[PDB]
Amino acid sequence: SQPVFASPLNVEKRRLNEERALMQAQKANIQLPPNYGDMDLILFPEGSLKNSNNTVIPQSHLKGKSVALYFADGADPKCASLLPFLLNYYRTMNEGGANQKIEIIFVSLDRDREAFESHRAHMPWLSIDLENPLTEILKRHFRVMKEYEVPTYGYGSRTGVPSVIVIGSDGREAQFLPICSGLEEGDRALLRWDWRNTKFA
Amino acid sequence: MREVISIHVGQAGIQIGNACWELFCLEHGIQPDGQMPDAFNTFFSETGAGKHVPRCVFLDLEPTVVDEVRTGTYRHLFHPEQLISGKEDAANNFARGHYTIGKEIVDLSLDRIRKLADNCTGLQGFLMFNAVGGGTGSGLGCLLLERLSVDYGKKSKLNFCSWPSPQVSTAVVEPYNSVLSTHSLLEHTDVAVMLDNEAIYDICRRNLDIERPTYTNLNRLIAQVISSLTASLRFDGALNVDVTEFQTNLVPYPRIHFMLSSYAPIISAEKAYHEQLSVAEITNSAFEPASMMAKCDPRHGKYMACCLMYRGDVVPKDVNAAVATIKTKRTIQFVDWCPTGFKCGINYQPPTVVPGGDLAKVMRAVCMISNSTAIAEVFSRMDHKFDLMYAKRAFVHWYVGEGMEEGEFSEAREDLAALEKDYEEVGI
Amino acid sequence: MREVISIHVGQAGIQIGNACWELFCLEHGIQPDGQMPDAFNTFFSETGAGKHVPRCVFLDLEPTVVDEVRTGTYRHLFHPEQLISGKEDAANNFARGHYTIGKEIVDLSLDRIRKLADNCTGLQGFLMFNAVGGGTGSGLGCLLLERLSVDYGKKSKLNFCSWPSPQVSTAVVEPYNSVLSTHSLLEHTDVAVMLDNEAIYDICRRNLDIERPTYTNLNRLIAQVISSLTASLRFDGALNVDVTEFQTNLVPYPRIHFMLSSYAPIISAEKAYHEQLSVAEITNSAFEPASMMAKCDPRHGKYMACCLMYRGDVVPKDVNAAVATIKTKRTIQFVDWCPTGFKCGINYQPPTVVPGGDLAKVMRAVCMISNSTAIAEVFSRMDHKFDLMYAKRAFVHWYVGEGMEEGEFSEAREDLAALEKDYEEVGI
Amino acid sequence: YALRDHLDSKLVPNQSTDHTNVLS
Amino acid sequence: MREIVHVQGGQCGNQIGAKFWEVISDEHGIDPTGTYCGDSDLQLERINVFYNEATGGRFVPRAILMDLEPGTMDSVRAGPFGQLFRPDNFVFGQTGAGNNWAKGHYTEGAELIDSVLDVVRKEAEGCDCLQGFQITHSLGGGTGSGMGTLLISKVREEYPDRIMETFSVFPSPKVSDTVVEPYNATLSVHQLVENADEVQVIDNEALYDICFRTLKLTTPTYGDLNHLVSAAMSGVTCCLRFPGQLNSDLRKLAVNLIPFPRLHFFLIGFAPLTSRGSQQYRALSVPELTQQMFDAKNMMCASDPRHGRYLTASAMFRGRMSTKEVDEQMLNVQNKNSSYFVEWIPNNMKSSVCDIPPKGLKMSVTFVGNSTAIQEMFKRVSDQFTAMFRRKAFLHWYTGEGMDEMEFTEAESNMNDLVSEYQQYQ
Amino acid sequence: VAKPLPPPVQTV
Amino acid sequence: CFFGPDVVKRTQQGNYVPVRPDHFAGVSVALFFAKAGHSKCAQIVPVVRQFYKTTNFSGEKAVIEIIYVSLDKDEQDFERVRALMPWCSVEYKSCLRKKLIERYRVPNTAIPLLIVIGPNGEEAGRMNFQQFVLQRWDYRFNKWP
Numbered sequence A: 001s002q003p004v005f006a007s008p009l010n011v012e013k014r015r016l017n018e019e020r021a022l023m024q025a026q027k028a029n030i031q032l033p034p035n036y037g038d039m040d041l042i043l044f045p046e047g048s049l050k051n052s053n054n055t056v057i058p059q060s061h062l063k064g065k066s067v068a069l070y071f072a073d074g075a076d077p078k079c080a081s082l083l084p085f086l087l088n089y090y091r092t093m094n095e096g097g098a099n100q101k102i103e104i105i106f107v108s109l110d111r112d113r114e115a116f117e118s119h120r121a122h123m124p125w126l127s128i129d130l131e132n133p134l135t136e137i138l139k140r141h142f143r144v145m146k147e148y149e150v151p152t153y154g155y156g157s158r159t160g161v162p163s164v165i166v167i168g169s170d171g172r173e174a175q176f177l178p179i180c181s182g183l184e185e186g187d188r189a190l191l192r193w194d195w196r197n198t199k200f201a
Numbered sequence B, C: 001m002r003e004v005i006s007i008h009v010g011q012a013g014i015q016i017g018n019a020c021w022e023l024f025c026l027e028h029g030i031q032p033d034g035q036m037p038d039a040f041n042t043f044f045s046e047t048g049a050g051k052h053v054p055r056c057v058f059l060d061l062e063p064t065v066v067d068e069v070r071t072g073t074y075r076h077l078f079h080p081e082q083l084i085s086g087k088e089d090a091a092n093n094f095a096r097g098h099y100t101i102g103k104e105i106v107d108l109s110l111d112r113i114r115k116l117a118d119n120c121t122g123l124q125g126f127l128m129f130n131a132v133g134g135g136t137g138s139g140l141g142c143l144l145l146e147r148l149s150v151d152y153g154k155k156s157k158l159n160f161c162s163w164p165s166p167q168v169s170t171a172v173v174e175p176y177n178s179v180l181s182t183h184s185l186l187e188h189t190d191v192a193v194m195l196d197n198e199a200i201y202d203i204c205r206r207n208l209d210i211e212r213p214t215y216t217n218l219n220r221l222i223a224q225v226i227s228s229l230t231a232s233l234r235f236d237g238a239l240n241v242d243v244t245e246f247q248t249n250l251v252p253y254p255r256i257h258f259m260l261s262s263y264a265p266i267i268s269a270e271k272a273y274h275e276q277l278s279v280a281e282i283t284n285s286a287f288e289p290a291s292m293m294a295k296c297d298p299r300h301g302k303y304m305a306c307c308l309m310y311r312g313d314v315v316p317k318d319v320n321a322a323v324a325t326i327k328t329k330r331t332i333q334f335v336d337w338c339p340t341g342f343k344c345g346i347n348y349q350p351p352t353v354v355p356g357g358d359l360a361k362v363m364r365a366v367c368m369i370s371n372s373t374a375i376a377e378v379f380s381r382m383d384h385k386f387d388l389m390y391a392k393r394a395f396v397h398w399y400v401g402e403g404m405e406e407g408e409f410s411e412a413r414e415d416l417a418a419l420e421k422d423y424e425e426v427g428i
Numbered sequence D: 001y002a003l004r005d006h007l008d009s010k011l012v013p014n015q016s017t018d019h020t021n022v023l024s
Numbered sequence E: 001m002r003e004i005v006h007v008q009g010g011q012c013g014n015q016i017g018a019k020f021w022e023v024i025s026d027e028h029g030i031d032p033t034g035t036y037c038g039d040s041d042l043q044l045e046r047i048n049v050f051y052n053e054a055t056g057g058r059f060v061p062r063a064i065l066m067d068l069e070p071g072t073m074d075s076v077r078a079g080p081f082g083q084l085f086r087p088d089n090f091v092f093g094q095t096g097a098g099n100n101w102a103k104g105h106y107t108e109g110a111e112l113i114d115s116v117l118d119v120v121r122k123e124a125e126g127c128d129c130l131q132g133f134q135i136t137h138s139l140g141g142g143t144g145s146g147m148g149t150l151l152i153s154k155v156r157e158e159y160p161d162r163i164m165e166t167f168s169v170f171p172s173p174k175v176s177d178t179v180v181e182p183y184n185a186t187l188s189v190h191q192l193v194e195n196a197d198e199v200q201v202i203d204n205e206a207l208y209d210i211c212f213r214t215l216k217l218t219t220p221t222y223g224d225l226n227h228l229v230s231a232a233m234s235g236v237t238c239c240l241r242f243p244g245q246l247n248s249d250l251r252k253l254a255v256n257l258i259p260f261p262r263l264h265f266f267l268i269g270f271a272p273l274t275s276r277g278s279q280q281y282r283a284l285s286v287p288e289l290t291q292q293m294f295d296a297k298n299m300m301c302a303s304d305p306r307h308g309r310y311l312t313a314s315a316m317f318r319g320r321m322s323t324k325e326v327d328e329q330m331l332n333v334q335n336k337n338s339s340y341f342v343e344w345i346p347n348n349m350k351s352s353v354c355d356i357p358p359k360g361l362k363m364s365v366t367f368v369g370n371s372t373a374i375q376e377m378f379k380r381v382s383d384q385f386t387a388m389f390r391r392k393a394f395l396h397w398y399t400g401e402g403m404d405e406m407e408f409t410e411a412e413s414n415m416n417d418l419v420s421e422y423q424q425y426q
Numbered sequence F: 001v002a003k004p005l006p007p008p009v010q011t012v
Numbered sequence G: 001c002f003f004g005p006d007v008v009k010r011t012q013q014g015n016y017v018p019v020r021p022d023h024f025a026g027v028s029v030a031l032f033f034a035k036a037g038h039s040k041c042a043q044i045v046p047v048v049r050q051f052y053k054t055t056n057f058s059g060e061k062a063v064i065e066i067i068y069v070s071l072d073k074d075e076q077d078f079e080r081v082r083a084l085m086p087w088c089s090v091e092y093k094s095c096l097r098k099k100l101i102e103r104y105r106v107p108n109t110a111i112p113l114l115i116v117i118g119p120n121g122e123e124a125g126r127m128n129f130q131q132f133v134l135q136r137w138d139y140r141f142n143k144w145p
Ligand SMILES: Nc1nc2c(ncn2[C@@H]2O[C@H](COP(=O)(O)OP(=O)(O)OP(=O)(O)O)[C@@H](O)[C@H]2O)c(=O)[nH]1
Pocket: B009, B010, B011, B012, B013, B015, B016, B060, B089, B090, B091, B092, B093, B130, B131, B133, B134, B135, B136, B137, B138, B162, B169, B170, B171, B174, B196, B197, B215, B216, B218, B219, E245, E246, E247
């Protein structure tokens, strides 16, 4: 149910693990349909997150890190103003201390492939390659739509480009960082991060 | 069994109760419909097979904020005949909320709360949430209080009203409604907290940053205050102070019950975590003149009675030391005939934090209610702005043209004048 | 194997038993086709290979509602000549129901009553369902009840009449139909119950939020009342009442057998599960004049004897506390010669909820059938309609043409008149 | 939750269980 | 709940209102064929404020159309968003109001009155309630000024508790057509003070001045005239149609904007009104909406509020903005230039916040302010009335159709009481 | 029309 | 096996999936008959949609489920309204939809309509919309085994 039902991630999650639940029940009293605590999912696939030098890493590498997706566009002036401040925040948070606290997962709303790497090369944190379905699955799941071209299921869109947004463990939503929202603090709600409260596990 | 009835009225009543009841849902551990996936029995009533329907009787005269509760995510939470929406608004007018669009909706509000009072074993308090500068929050606030006092007279009642503010208004007929709501605040109610709207704008400015907070953030800080206030009834604890103990210790004399409020762990996560939250500094911020939500600086007032409701892992050893340095502070002066009055209570259950909100996870808390005589000036700035328009009878043709008689203005004016001399004589 | 035979007469009777046998089939797990996937031997009879034909008879002079069952989903449930259809109607005429046409269908009717009583092994009574506002419920029911009292004199004759409304009419000649029918159900029935239509409209509106009820909405509430009457005759449990003690414990004098009715867990899924339902408040709602299934406001007059039949999870301790709170309040004023007038039945089976209709799984239930001296107002709105009609001798030319010489209008008027003074001296 | 009435003293009270250099 | 019924009157009233039912139908998402395509519940939760239901799911506007001349009835029906209207709401004559005020109020418009009150009655009586009646008309003409206010008087008799929201087009100061502008104007504002409520002000030279400077239309149209008024329609009736944080129905506007009963003349205005050249360069925030909406180059009345003083003002914010960010902007604009706010009413402004923005824009505000400066307009109506009446001009129509020169001179005498009353309240 | 039969009440 | 093959479609973006056979355990099922381009369907769909989300994803167990059956005349129109309805639907080319309509007596103004159904497959509650009425049906009615 978190954050919204109308989302490919949530519907495939409930389909897969609920099929798993009645596979277990056919093999063997369990409650139907299963509970929110019962449904569990691996969120990103094996070929999802790539660092600089383009080495793909598994999901378990994000253990113990406050992780946030970042929906961004190369040609967008909000993203152009946002990117140096977010680089400085990533700088300071990951360099001051003995641990790497924050980690950022990038999703692009760019026009095409060349724009995707021209925006990607400026950035050091992990990302999803645009060609796989995971980019559109994530932006449809979290409702980050630049301009309404794909019909929604009744939810008014929260935020378009840009959006840094912290992610929980099981695909849930912890909180939204208010850069372009009803609160509207671009470049200074980036410090509203809760890096030891929100932890990926 | 202990229990309490919430009697929200007005769009301020609905919206403050919206933040106050989502907090009670997450605190007790009930999901938005009815279930846990024995402290619930003071704000909810058991259905016998699941559902925890609340004890709220949410009232308004229009279907624009009631219907968004009716179609929101809490649709199967409230009993639908407790959400009572009228047909036409009072429109910032005390005369329509008391006479015109009147008795046809307050008689249906009464048998719902009669059934609530019957389906509860030993009743303790009546929490009223309203805005007194408006329409239904003042007029239906007064009709439903005159009727509540004459049949339910033995039990107490707590009017947490949104008192009109000096500078920020969002209304211009605002000085009439609250002067005429003084009857529902002076001789027909028990303890009452004057919570303002830009006093709470400042406490989230200084401490939470928040460049532009809406009403949703404001109703959640009021929800924190109300939560910790009736927290002692809900959970266990050390030495407790309950609703009947509020009036026996805060109220000195029968008419003085106009009160301030100051929660003070209102800290965001970035500010708080570079900071220790021990009970010494949270009670200096509790007595700090800007952290109180009314704008009346108590340094030019005089405290008469202070009840402090601490929450979290507050041992009684350090709260006696924390109030001890409050003695030594000269800027917090007290009245001479109440030397000993500090009534403190400690809950164990640390404050639950609303997800996606603005309070950080804090292990300690304190909410202070005070009887400072500075509250007289909260009535005097409204006395000035009532006299300015009434001097040439402005706006009163639509105060007498629908059932109210002229001359109720003048005796309500005399009630504020007698109130100001009442707070003058109680000090000296 | 205790059991009853239900005789449905008139168009109201066909549709009442239409939803009533829907409820009885759904209660005992019987398909519309008559099969199964000792309680069933009260309303259904085994016919070999797992077949349960009902124990009713449908009777009407017009062949437009009974053959309308012959081509329905329950067409292969009832016996083919159990559904007896006339050829010409009575057309709102007591004279055409009782004197002309008439007897041609009656001698075939008791051919099926006698044949149905052959399989009876301890028959306990008859349940007539008819309208006294029409012609084939009034005239045919008068000659039917008189002839059954000749054949089976000692058997119970539970008589469920839909008496005409004070305002709702659907005709104009119902003052003639029911008053001429009064001489039938006043000395040929054993317990008559009045089921006024507009009162059942108001319970479907005030409680169910259904502001547009149709006839099958009313008929399901009638089926829910009758199912609770005969619940003790099929399902076992706590302190029981049967039909034989139902007459003796509610009928003080043989001349007085008119009765009221109210079933009051009556609520749809909007409010049912949010509201806490228990024996204290469902009994208090049953005695409430707004839940009463006739326009027979019981503040008038005295009560005489009330039967409270509860089906579901009721223990015998809290039924006695519920009855005790009825004694204490002053609005329910009893008669001086019946101190201990209260007969309680408690079953174990909860109310069988019909799909589609606006009923919930209320685990408890109440089924009031209460006698009162307020029944005189049901017949005192009747007599001024009869007097204004018969003052100048109008609409009687239809009656006198088809039998019915002049004078049955006058003796029926003084018979119902003496019924009013009968209720007057029984009071004080 | 009895976390005010912590037993910090045994039956007999005996209060419960819980830089310098070298100039040799 | 909250039924508002449009009572469209005059030539100008029917194209002002045809664009009203073009922007309200766009905001609630209705095709001209009568179906819905918006896929949202919040769109379809206050349809009954302006749309009665009809069989087969088709909505109809609660809109009585009214003229004496069927040419502009044909234009409304033929145009887009025009075949949604009920055909017996088309109550029209065949003679034509020839810009004569007597011709609407005391002759032929008055025999069509019994037909137009019939269709007003049928769409008002059968309901649960109605908040008020909406009326657009064309003071200075024949129809909207003429029998148009006769329908105002008779509705005032039938329902003397409901609010009369009247969007009236006063005559232009600079230049206009229709030589008998002064004769229609004063005689109509005779009865718009006592069988009346909020009488808000709209002017043609005024609205022209927005679409030359504020919007830079090189070739403006009368459709652009009706569209700016139609944007102000949605702003003034927004909390009756969409939820907010501080809801304010249309009667709540009146109670905190009228100090004395005849003081009911309101400047209307819309913001943001940005040109295409400046579309992407400017920003959209509450300080910019406030600076634009108090800007006298934006007001839809040609009266300049700096030559006066705001008695009381009100605002209709609509968007995802902060209720805080509104209310120190109201405080700041009250404190900088306090010379244009009265001293005898403290804190001269109401603010309302609707959660739901207008169609398109992220945020928008509508200004309804009772400035006393409107006597620039009223003395302009007076001083041209004195010129024509003192030398008995054009009166052989106004007295030959069934009046006398008593009604003219006491319409003038009522009129001078109005300019006097605003004067000491300043 | 034909209706779903209720589930059987298991003995308690 | 009642429905039988893949014909019961579960929504999914990127690829198209059938909902599994015994998904319907412990849930209450309503057939939603609609047709695109109908004026009434245009408001019945969002109300039952908001009700669908609000009722179904408050409780941790899924409580309601809606099966969409359509009287469309165009497969592309059916696709663009199936992409607008968030609940389970049925295939356009499948004849199970024709069987359901012909069984349940849906005319080709009674549209749109609800029929909540029981575990075996018969009618348990009929709900039209021809004119606050949607709250009448309860999710705890058709508890399925
Ligand atoms: N604390 C708080 N105060 C509010 C809120 N909303 C409005 N108010 C205050 O309420 C005052 C006006 O009363 P309203 O609540 O808006 O209206 P009402 O009480 O329902 O009475 P009506 O005029 O009949 O609608 C405003 O001046 C605001 O200061 C809110 O969400 N929280």
